[PDB]
Amino acid sequence: AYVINEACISCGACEPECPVNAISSGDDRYVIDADTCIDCGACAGVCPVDAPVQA
Numbered sequence: 001a002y003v004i005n006e007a008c009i010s011c012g013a014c015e016p017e018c019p020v021n022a023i024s025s026g027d028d029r030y031v032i033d034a035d036t037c038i039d040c041g042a043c044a045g046v047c048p049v050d051a052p053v054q055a
């Protein structure tokens with residue numbers, strides 16, 4: 001799983017780009033569904049602040 005850390009500025013750019021729709025808007029920051037994430041790294045590639053990190 002990747003997890004979006006506290007650097008997220010809630011820009012929303014990563015949500016459309018997840019190939020398996022694992023990202024949604026949450027309170028404070030966006031959230032990854034760890035039961036769907038397949039570690040592709042796409043969200044980190046479109047993140048301006050590089051908040052998604054592999055855990």
Ligand code: SF4
Binds near residue numbers: 022
């Ligand atoms: S790593 Fe890939 S599968 Fe996991 S949330 Fe980011 S874009 Fe979606």
Ligand code: SF4
Binds near residue numbers: 004011015050
């Ligand atoms: S692209 Fe980065 S800052 Fe923008 S919502 Fe996704 S994780 Fe947060």
